[PDB]
Amino acid sequence: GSVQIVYKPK
């Protein structure tokens, strides 16, 4: 349905 993603560092 839905998700919040918090990305690892670039």
Partner: nanobody
Framework: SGGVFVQSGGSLRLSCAAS????????MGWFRQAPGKEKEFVSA?????????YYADSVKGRFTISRDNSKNMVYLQMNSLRAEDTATYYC???????????QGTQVTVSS
């Protein structure tokens, strides 16, 4: 409303239950969201020993993430806290170091 309060320079340890590597997830970590700001990565660790230990630039050298697979626990040692660490801290499962959220610990650090 309510949360933890730490003096600048102080320390704090967080913990999070970690189910173990499912089909979808190979790790656990933490992000944080400060008042009026976006959610920001903090740290992530792999269930597999060696595989990955990511830190945001803003916390390198001060925070340490660790795992105890025997207890299904993950831990964040937060040292040398500063006022800019003030935020709500959330833990989430990780795949390859990215955090997936579908429940938080508010922390205020005073100068």
């Amino acid at each position: 409303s309510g949360g933890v309060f730490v003096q600048s320079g102080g320390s704090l340890r967080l913990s999070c239950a970690a189910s173990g590597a499912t089909s979808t997830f190979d790790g656990m970590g933490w992000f944080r969201q400060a008042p009026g700001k976006e959610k920001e990565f903090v740290s992530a660790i792999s269930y597999e020993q060696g595989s990955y230990t990511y830190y945001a630039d803003s916390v390198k050298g001060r925070f340490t993430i660790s795992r105890d697979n025997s207890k299904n626990m993950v831990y964040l040692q937060m040292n040398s806290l500063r006022a800019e660490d003030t935020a709500t801290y959330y833990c989430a499962p990780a795949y390859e170091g990215d955090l997936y959220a579908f429940q938080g610990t508010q922390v205020t650090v005073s100068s």
